[PDB]
Amino acid sequence: SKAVTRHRRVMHFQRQKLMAVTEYIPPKPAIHPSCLPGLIRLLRREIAAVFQDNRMIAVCQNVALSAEDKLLMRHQLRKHKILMKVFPNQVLKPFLEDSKYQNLLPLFVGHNMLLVSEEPKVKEMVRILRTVPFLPLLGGCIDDTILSRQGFINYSK
Amino acid sequence: GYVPKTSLSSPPWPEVVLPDPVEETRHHAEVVKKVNEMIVTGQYGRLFAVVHFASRQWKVTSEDLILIGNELDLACGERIRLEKVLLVGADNFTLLGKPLLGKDLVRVEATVIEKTESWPRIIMRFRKRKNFKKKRIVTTPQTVLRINSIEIAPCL
């Protein structure tokens, strides 16, 4: 058999013993190492500007709609100067403690959309929400005073 | 550095605590004194020695025979003190040297009885197809020793 073959040629036995003795040994540490120890500021400036803007705020669980249905809700609230805002609560949890909202820290989680306002059409917004047997009103906060949904009935009325 | 008791927490063998060398060297002194009293007052019966005569170790009592595979160049009848005794045992004690015992402790005597040759002992070589066939016949010299006595002495 030639020195170059098509199959891996069988080594001489001392060749093979050399190859086994001179194998690579990796280092072993005494302790395993794994067992040892722009858009963000766009949201901060934008939503922080929305904090100082609104006198009244409300919020819902606006995930339970269709696209054209959210277009209808977008137009029926476009009829007012109220604004709706889908934004991550991931950044909104440091937003509240920045804006000194300690009663609003247990408010903003899961799917939610802001209803920031200065003029309450929120009674008529409830009039739009009464025809759909879901999507409840989550509590707001006008001028560092919290609004329960009962408070939305009282203030909205 | 605590490990809770699992299968592989501890090694499987039980730990031995070897005794401290103060009470242990004192204890050895007690034992050697006992055995030395047995050698003084003659408590033992018959002894056996392991003796490194020639090139090999013979286990040996009194009144027996050893066949040695060389001519010792002594006359028949000559007594011999076998040095190089390396174990001496009685019924209730033994004494074993590192590696040999003291000459002042043990004395093993042996007489030469006979100086024979061996039976004729063949040495044949043969390789096939090569016409290779040698034959030799060898008899080695031999002497027989009769171990007379294993005397022991109180030197501990």
């Binding site: 395993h32 067992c35 120890p37 | 550095g1 490990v3 809770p4 592989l8 499987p12």
Partner: protein, 146 residues
């Protein structure tokens, strides 16, 4: 732990939460194995260690709840498999040949009808190679193939 009590009424009652022993001997370890100096010092024999990671119907607990190492989660997962089959967890039922050290599921292994020549012999797996790096107090290591 919490339970789901039902009768039609369905409520959830947090009942009898345990806690880990106050002094890990290796604090600032990561896994609860790593915290207690048990990185290679458990097997399928010792069921006091295995039982703490098992659902009461015999299954494993996920890695996020136990907070195990990835390595030690596969090791405990394997040891728990190897200990259900040796009958060491009899009370982790939902409601006969003696085995131990069984790597594969007993009803899934074809018998070796042609064990090979001496240089290509089909061997029988014994134990798991996840447990290679355990402390062997013998000189010969664990033979994983019989």
């Amino acid at each position: 732990f919490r339970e789901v009590v039902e009768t039609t009424i369905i409520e959830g009652r947090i009942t009898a939460t345990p806690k880990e022993s106050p002094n890990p001997p290796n604090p600032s370890g990561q896994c609860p194995i790593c915290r207690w100096n048990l990185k290679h010092k458990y097997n399928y024999d010792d069921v006091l260690l295995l039982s703490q990671f098992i659902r009461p119907h015999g299954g494993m607990l996920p890695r996020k709840i136990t907070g195990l190492c990835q390595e030690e989660h596969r090791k405990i997962e394997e040891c728990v498999k190897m200990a259900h089959r040796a009958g060491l967890l009899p009370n982790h039922r939902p409601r006969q040949l003696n085995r131990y050290l069984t790597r594969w599921a007993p009803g899934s292994v074809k018998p070796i009808y042609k064990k090979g020549p001496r240089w290509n012999r089909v061997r029988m797996p014994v134990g798991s190679p996840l447990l290679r790096d355990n402390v062997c107090y013998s000189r010969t290591p664990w033979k994983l193939y019989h």
